[PDB]
mmCIF file of C-alpha atoms in Angstrom:
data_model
loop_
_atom_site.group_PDB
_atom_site.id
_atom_site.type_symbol
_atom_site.label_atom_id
_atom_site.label_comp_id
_atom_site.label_asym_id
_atom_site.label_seq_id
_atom_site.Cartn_x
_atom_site.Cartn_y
_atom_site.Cartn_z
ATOM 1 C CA UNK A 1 -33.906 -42.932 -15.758
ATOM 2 C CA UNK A 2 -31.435 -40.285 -15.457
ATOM 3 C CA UNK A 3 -28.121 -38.555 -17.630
ATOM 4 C CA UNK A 4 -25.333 -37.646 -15.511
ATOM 5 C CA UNK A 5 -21.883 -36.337 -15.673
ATOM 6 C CA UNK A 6 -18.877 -39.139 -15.166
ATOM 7 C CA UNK A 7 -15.305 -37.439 -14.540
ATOM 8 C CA UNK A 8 -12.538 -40.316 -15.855
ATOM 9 C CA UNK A 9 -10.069 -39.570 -13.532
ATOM 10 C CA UNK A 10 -6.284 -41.451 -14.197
ATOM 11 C CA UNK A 11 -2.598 -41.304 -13.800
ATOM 12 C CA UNK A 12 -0.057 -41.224 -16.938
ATOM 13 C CA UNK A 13 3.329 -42.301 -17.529
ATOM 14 C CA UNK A 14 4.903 -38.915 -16.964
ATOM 15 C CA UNK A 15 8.567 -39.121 -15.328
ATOM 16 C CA UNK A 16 10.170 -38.657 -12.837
ATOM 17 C CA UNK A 17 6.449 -38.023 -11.038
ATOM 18 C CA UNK A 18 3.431 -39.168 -13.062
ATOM 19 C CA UNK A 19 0.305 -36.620 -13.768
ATOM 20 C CA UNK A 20 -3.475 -36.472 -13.104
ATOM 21 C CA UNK A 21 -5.515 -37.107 -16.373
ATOM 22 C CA UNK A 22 -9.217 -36.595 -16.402
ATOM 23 C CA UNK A 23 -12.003 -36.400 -19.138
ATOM 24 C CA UNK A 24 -15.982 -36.066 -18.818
ATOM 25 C CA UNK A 25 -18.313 -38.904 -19.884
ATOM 26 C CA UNK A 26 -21.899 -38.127 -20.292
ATOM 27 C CA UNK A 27 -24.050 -41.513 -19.204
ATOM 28 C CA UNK A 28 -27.288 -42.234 -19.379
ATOM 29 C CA UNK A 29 -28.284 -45.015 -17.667
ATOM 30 C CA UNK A 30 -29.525 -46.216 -14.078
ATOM 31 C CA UNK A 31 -27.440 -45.386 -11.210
ATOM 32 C CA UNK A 32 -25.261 -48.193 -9.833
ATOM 33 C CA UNK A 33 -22.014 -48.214 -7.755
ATOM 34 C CA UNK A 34 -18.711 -48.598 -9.906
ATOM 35 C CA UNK A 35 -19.583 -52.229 -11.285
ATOM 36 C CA UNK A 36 -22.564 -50.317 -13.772
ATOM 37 C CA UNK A 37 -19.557 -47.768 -15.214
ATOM 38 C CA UNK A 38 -17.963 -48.429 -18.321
ATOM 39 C CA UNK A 39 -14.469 -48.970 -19.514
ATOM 40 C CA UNK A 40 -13.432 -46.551 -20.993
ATOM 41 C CA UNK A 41 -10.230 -45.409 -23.181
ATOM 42 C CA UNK A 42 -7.908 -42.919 -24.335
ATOM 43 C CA UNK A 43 -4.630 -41.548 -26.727
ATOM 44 C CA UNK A 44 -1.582 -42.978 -24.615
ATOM 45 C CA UNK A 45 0.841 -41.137 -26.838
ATOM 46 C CA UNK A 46 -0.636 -37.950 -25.594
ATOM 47 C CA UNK A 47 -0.202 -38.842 -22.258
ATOM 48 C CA UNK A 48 3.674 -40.606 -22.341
ATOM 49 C CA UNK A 49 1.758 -44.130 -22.030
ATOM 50 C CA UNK A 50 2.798 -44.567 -25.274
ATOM 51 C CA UNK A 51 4.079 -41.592 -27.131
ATOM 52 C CA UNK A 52 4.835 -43.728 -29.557
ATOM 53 C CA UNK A 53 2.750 -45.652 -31.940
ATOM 54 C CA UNK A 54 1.422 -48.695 -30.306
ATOM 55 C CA UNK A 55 -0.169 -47.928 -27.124
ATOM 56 C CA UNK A 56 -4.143 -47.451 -26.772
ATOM 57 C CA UNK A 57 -5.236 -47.508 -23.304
ATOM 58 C CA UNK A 58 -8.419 -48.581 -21.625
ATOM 59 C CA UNK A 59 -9.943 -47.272 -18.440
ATOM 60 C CA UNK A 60 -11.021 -49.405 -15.506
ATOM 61 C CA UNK A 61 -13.044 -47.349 -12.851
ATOM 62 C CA UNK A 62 -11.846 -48.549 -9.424
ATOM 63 C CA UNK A 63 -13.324 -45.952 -6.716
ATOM 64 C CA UNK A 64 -16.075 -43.320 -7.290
ATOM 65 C CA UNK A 65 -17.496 -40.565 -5.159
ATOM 66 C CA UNK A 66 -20.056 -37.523 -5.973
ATOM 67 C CA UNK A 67 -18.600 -34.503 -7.735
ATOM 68 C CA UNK A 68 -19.124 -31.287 -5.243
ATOM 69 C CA UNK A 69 -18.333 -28.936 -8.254
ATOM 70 C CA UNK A 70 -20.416 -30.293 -10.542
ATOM 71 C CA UNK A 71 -22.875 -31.341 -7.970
ATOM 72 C CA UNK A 72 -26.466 -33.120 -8.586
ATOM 73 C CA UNK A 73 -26.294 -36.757 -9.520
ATOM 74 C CA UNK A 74 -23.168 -36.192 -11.508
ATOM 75 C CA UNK A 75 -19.724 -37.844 -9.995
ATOM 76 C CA UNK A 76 -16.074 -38.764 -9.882
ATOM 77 C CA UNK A 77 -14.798 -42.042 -11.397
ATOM 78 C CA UNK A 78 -11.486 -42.913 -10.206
ATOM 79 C CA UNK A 79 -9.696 -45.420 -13.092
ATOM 80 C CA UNK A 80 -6.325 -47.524 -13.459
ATOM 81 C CA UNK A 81 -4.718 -47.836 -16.533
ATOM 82 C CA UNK A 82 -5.070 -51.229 -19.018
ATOM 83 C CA UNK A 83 -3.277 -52.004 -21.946
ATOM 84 C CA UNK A 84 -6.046 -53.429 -24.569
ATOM 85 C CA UNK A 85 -5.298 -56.845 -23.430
ATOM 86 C CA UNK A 86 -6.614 -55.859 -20.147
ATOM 87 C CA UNK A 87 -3.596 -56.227 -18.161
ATOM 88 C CA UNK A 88 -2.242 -53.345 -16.501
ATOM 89 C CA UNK A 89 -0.290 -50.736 -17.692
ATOM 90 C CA UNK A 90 3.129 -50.681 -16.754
ATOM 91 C CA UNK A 91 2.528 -46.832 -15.769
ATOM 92 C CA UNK A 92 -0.226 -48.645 -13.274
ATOM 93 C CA UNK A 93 0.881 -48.762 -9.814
ATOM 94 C CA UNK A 94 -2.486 -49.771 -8.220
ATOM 95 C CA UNK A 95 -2.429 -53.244 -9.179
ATOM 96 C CA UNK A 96 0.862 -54.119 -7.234
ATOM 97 C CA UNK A 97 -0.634 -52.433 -4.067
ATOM 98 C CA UNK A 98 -3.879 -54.503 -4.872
ATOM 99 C CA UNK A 99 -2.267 -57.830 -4.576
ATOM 100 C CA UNK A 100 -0.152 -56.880 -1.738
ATOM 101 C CA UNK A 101 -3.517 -55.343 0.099
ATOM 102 C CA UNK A 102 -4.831 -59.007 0.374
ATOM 103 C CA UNK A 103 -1.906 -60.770 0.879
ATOM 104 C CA UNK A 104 -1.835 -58.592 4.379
ATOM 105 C CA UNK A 105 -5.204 -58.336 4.638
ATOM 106 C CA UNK A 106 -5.382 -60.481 8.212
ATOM 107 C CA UNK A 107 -2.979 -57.939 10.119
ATOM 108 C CA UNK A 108 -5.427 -54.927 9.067
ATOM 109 C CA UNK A 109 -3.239 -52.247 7.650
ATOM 110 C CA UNK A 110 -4.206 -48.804 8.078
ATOM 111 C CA UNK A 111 -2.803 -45.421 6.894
ATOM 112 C CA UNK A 112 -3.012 -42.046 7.693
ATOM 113 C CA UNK A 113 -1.245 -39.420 5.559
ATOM 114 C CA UNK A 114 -0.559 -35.811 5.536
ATOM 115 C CA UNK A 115 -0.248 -34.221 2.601
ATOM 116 C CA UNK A 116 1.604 -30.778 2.038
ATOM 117 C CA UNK A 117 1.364 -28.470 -0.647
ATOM 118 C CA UNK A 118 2.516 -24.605 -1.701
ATOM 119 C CA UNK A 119 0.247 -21.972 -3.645
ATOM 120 C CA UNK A 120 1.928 -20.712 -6.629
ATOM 121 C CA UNK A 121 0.808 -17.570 -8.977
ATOM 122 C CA UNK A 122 2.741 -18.521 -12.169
ATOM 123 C CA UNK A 123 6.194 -18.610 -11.309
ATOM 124 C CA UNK A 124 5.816 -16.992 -7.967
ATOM 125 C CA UNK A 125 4.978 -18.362 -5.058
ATOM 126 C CA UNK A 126 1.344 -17.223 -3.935
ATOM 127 C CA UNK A 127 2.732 -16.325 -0.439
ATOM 128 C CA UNK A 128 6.052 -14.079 -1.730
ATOM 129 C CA UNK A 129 6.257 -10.533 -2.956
ATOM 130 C CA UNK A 130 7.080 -10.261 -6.653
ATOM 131 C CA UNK A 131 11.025 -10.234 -7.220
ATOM 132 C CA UNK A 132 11.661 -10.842 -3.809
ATOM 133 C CA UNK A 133 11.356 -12.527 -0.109
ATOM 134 C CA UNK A 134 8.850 -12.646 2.581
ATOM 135 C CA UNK A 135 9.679 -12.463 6.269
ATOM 136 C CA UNK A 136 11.365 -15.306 7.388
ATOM 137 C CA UNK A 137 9.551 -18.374 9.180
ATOM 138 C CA UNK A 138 7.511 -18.443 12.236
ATOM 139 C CA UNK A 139 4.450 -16.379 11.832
ATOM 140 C CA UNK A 140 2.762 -18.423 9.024
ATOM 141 C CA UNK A 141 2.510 -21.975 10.182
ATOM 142 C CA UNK A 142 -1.450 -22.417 11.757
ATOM 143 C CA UNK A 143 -1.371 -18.360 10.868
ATOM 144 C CA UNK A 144 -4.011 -15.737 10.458
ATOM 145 C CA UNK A 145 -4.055 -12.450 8.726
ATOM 146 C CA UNK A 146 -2.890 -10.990 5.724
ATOM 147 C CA UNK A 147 0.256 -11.045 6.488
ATOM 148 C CA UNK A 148 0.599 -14.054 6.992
ATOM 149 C CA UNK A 149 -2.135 -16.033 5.488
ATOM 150 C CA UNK A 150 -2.300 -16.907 1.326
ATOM 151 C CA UNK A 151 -4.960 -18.889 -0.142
ATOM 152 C CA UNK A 152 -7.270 -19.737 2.475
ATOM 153 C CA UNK A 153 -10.360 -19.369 0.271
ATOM 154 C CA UNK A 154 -8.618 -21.978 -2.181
ATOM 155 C CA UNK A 155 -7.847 -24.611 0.760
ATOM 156 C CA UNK A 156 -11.482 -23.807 2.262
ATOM 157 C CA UNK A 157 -13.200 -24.260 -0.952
ATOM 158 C CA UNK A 158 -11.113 -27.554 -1.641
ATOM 159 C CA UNK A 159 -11.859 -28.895 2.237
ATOM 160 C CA UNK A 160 -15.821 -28.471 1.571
ATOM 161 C CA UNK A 161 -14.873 -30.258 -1.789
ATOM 162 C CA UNK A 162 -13.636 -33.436 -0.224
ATOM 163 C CA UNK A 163 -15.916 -33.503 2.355
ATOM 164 C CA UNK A 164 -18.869 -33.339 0.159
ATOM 165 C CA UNK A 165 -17.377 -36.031 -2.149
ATOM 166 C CA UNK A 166 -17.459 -38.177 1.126
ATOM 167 C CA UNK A 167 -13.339 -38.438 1.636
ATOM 168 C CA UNK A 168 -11.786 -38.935 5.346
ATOM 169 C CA UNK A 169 -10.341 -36.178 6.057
ATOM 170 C CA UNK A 170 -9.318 -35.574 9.421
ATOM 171 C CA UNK A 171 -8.080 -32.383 9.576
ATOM 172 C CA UNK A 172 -5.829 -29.053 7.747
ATOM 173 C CA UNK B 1 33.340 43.289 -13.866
ATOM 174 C CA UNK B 2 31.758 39.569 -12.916
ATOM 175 C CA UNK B 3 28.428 37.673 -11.295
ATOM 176 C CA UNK B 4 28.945 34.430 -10.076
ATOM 177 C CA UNK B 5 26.677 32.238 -7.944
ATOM 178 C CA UNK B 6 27.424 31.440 -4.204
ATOM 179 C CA UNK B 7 25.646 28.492 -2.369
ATOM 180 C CA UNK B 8 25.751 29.199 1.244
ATOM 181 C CA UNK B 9 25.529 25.924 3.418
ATOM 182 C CA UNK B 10 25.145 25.442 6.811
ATOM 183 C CA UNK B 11 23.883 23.267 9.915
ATOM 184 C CA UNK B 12 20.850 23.865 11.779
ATOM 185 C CA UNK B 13 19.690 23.341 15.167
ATOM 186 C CA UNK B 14 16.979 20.467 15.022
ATOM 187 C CA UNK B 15 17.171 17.504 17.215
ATOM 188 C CA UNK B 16 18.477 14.983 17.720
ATOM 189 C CA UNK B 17 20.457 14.762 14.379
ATOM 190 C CA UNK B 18 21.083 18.309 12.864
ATOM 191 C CA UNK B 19 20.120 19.382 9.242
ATOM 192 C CA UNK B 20 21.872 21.173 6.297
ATOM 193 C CA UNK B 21 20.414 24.136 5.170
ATOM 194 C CA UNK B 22 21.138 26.025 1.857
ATOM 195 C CA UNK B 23 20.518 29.046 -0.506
ATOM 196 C CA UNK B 24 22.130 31.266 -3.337
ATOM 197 C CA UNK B 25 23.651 34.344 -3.126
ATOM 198 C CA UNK B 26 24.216 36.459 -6.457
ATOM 199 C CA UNK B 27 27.681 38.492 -6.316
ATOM 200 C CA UNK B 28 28.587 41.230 -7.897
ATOM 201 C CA UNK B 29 32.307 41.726 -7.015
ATOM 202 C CA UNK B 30 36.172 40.486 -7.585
ATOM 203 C CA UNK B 31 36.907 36.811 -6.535
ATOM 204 C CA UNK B 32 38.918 36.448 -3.343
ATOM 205 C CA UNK B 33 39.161 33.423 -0.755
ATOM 206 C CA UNK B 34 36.767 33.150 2.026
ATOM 207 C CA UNK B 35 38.040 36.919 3.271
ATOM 208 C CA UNK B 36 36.026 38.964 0.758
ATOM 209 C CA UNK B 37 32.727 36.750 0.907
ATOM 210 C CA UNK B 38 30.338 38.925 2.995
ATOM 211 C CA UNK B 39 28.552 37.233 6.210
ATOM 212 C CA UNK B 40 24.715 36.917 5.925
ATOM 213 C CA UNK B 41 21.748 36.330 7.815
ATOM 214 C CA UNK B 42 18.657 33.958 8.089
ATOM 215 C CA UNK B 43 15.175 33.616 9.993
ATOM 216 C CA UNK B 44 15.755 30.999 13.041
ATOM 217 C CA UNK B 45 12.662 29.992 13.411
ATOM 218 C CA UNK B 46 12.226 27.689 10.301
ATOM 219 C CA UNK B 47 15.232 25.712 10.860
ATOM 220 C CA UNK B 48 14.761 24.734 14.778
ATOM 221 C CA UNK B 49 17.951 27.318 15.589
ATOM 222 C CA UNK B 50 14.499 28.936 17.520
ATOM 223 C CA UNK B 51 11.263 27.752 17.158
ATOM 224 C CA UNK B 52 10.800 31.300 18.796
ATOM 225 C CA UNK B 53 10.210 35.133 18.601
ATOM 226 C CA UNK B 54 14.112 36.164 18.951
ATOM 227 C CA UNK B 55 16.317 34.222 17.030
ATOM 228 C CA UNK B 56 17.482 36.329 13.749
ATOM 229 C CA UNK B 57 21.419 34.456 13.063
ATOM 230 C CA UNK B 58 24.532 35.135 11.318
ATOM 231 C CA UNK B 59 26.509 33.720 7.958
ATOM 232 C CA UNK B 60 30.061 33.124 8.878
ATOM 233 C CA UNK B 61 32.073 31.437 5.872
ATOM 234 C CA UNK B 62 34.276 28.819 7.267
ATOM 235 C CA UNK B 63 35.298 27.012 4.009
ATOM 236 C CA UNK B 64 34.699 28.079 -0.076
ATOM 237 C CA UNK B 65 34.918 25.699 -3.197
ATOM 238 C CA UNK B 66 33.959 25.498 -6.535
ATOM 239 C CA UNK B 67 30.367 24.355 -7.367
ATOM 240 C CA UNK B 68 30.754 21.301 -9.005
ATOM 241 C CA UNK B 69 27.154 21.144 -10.223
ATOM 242 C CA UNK B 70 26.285 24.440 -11.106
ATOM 243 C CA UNK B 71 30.183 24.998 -12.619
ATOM 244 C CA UNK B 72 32.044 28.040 -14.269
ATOM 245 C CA UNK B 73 32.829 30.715 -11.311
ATOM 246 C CA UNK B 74 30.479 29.955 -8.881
ATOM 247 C CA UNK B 75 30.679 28.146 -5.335
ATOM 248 C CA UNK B 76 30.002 26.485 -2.361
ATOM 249 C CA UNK B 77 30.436 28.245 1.090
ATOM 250 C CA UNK B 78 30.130 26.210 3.943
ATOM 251 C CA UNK B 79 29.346 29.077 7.024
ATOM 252 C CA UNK B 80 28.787 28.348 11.077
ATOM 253 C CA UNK B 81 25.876 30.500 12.734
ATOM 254 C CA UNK B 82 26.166 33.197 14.843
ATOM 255 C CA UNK B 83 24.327 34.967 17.244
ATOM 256 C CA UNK B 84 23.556 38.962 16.236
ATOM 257 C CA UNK B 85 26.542 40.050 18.472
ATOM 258 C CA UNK B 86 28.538 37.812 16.208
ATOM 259 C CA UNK B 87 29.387 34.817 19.216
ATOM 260 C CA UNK B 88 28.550 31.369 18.487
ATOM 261 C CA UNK B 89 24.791 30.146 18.373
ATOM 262 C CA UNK B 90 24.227 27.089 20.590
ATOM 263 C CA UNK B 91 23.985 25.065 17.626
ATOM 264 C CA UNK B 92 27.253 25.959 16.519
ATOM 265 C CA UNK B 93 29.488 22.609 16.923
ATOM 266 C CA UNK B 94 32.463 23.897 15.009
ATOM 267 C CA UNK B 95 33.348 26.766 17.732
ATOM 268 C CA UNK B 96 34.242 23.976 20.265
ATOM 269 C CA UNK B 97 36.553 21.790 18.111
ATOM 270 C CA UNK B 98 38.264 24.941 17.187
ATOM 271 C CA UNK B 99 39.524 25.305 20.626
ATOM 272 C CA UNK B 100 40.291 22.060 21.138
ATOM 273 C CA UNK B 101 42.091 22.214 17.837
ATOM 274 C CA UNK B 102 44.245 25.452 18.975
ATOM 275 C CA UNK B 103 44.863 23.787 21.884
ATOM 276 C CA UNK B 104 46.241 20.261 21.011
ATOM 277 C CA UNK B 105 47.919 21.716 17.519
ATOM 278 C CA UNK B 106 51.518 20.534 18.551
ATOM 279 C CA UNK B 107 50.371 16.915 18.595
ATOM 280 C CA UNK B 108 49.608 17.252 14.688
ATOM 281 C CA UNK B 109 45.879 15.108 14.925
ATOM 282 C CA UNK B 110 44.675 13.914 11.390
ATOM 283 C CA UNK B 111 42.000 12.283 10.796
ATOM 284 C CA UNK B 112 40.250 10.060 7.979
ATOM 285 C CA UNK B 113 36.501 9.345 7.739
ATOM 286 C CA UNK B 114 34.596 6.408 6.157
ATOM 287 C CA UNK B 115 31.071 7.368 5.601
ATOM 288 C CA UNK B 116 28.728 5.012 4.832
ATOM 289 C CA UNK B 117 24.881 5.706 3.803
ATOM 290 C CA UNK B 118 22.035 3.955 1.866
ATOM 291 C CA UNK B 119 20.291 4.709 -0.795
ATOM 292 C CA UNK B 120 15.901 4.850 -0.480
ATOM 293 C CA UNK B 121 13.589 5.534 -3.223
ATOM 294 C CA UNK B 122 10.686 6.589 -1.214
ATOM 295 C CA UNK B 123 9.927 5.169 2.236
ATOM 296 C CA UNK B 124 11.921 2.049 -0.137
ATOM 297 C CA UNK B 125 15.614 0.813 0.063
ATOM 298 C CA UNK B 126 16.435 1.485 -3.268
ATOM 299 C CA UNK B 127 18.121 -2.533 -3.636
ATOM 300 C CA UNK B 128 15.066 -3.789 -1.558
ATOM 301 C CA UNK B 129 11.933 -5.306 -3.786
ATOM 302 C CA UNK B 130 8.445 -3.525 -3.110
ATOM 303 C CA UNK B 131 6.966 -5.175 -0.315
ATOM 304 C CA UNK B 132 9.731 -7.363 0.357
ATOM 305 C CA UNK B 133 13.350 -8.767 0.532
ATOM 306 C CA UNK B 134 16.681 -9.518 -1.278
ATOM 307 C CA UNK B 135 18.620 -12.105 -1.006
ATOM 308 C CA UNK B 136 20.656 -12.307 1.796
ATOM 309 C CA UNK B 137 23.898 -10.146 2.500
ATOM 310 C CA UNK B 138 27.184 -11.586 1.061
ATOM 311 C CA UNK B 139 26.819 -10.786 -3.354
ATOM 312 C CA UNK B 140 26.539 -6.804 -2.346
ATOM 313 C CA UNK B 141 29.786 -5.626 -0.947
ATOM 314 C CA UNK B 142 31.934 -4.385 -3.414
ATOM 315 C CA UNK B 143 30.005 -6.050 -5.946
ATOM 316 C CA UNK B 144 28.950 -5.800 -9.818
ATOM 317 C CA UNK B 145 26.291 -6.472 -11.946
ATOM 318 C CA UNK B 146 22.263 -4.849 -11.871
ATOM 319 C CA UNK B 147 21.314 -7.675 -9.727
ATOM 320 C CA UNK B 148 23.723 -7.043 -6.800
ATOM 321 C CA UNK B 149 24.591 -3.384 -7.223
ATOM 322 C CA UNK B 150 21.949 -0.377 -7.360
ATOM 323 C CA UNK B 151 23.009 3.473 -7.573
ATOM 324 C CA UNK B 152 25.967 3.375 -9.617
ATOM 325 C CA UNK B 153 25.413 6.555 -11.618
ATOM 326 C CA UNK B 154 24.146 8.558 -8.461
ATOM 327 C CA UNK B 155 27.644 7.526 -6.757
ATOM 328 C CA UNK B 156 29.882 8.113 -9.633
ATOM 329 C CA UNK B 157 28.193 11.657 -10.210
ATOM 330 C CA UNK B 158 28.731 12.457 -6.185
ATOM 331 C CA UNK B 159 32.448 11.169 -6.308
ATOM 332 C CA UNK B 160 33.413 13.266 -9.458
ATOM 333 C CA UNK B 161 31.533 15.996 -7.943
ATOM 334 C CA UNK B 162 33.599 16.029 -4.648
ATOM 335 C CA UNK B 163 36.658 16.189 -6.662
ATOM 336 C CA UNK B 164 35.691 19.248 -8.895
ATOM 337 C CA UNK B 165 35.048 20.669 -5.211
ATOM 338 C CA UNK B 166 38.723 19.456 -4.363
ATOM 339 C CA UNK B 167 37.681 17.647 -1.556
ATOM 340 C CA UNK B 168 40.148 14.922 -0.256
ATOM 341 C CA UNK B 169 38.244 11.959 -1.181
ATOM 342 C CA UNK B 170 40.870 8.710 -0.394
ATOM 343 C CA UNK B 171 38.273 6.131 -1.926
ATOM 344 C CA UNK B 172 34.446 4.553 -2.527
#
């Protein structure tokens, strides 16, 4: 049997929006979907799920998916948050969706969701000049050219990413 | 007996927005207004009062002032252009409002003048970021501070300078 990369990914207790968290895991062990991973843990008091002097946290892999960067047999492990106890975290906002998931199970929920984002280089955004303004809307929206296109390599790069890692998406 | 410096101006004959021309003329001789300053001559062809093989023109001070940049004794004559039999050139505007001046004199017409212009560095508005925009109008007019205001010194300099000249400068 085989050694393979793990990325822990998780969400902290950062406010008023909470931050991605990830750390690599090297395992060595017989591939199995999500029940063969390991819990894992971390320092909540570098990650404002403590930052204090009593919180430990353990990682519970939840979702999991090939890593197209990495590539090979190595992969993405998707986590929520535990206190040591097991119970979630109070930064965990999984759980609640979890139980409310199967309490609605029977009318079949489904989502779709578009989700918008800007380029920035350092303070600037990717798509202005430095110290100043662009031209004003109109041109950029489903754009092409220089002029009016900024990071397409980035978003193409990221699309083959998802794709790769088996996610549904539908469109950009 | 005294040299002084005398910087003969005039207006060309390019289209469709006519150009200032200039050069020096070194004097050897006693100071008098306008009267005394000797009429002079140019080549046509480089300032689009020909473009041709018979244009030769005439110097004919109009209005003297100090220099207010080169300073001491020396000065500015502003001249119209004349044809070698001493009639206006076709470029000449001044001839025109002169008889219409003459003519009208008993109705006493004064007029005041507020001339705008912008300042460029390069093909560049000098308050415009390379590339780019400002903010939009409404912080420039009459403003202060670097981040609303740009040319400060060059406009000061020019305003003192009329002065010196004597011109009647109401405001900036």
């Amino acid at each position: 049997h085989m050694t393979f990369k793990a990325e822990y990914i998780w969400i902290d207790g950062t406010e008023p929006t909470a931050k991605l968290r990830s750390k690599t895991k090297i395992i060595t062990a017989a591939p199995a979907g999500l029940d063969a991973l390991p819990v894992w843990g971390f320092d909540g008091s570098s990650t404002n799920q403590a930052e204090g002097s009593s919180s430990d946290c353990v990682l519970k892999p939840v979702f999991s998916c090939p890593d197209p960067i990495r590539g090979g047999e190595d992969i993405l492990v998707l986590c929520e948050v535990l206190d040591t106890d097991m119970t979630p975290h109070p930064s965990n906002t999984r759980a609640a969706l979890a139980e409310l998931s199967e309490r609605f199970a029977a009318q079949e929920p489904v989502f779709g969701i578009e989700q918008e984002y800007t380029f920035f280089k350092g303070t600037r955004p990717l798509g202005f000049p430095e110290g100043g303004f662009p031209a004003a809307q109109g041109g950029y929206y489903c754009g092409v050219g220089s002029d009016e296109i900024f990071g397409r390599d980035v978003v193409e790069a990221h699309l083959e990413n998802c794709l790769k890692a088996g996610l549904g998406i539908s469109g950009i």
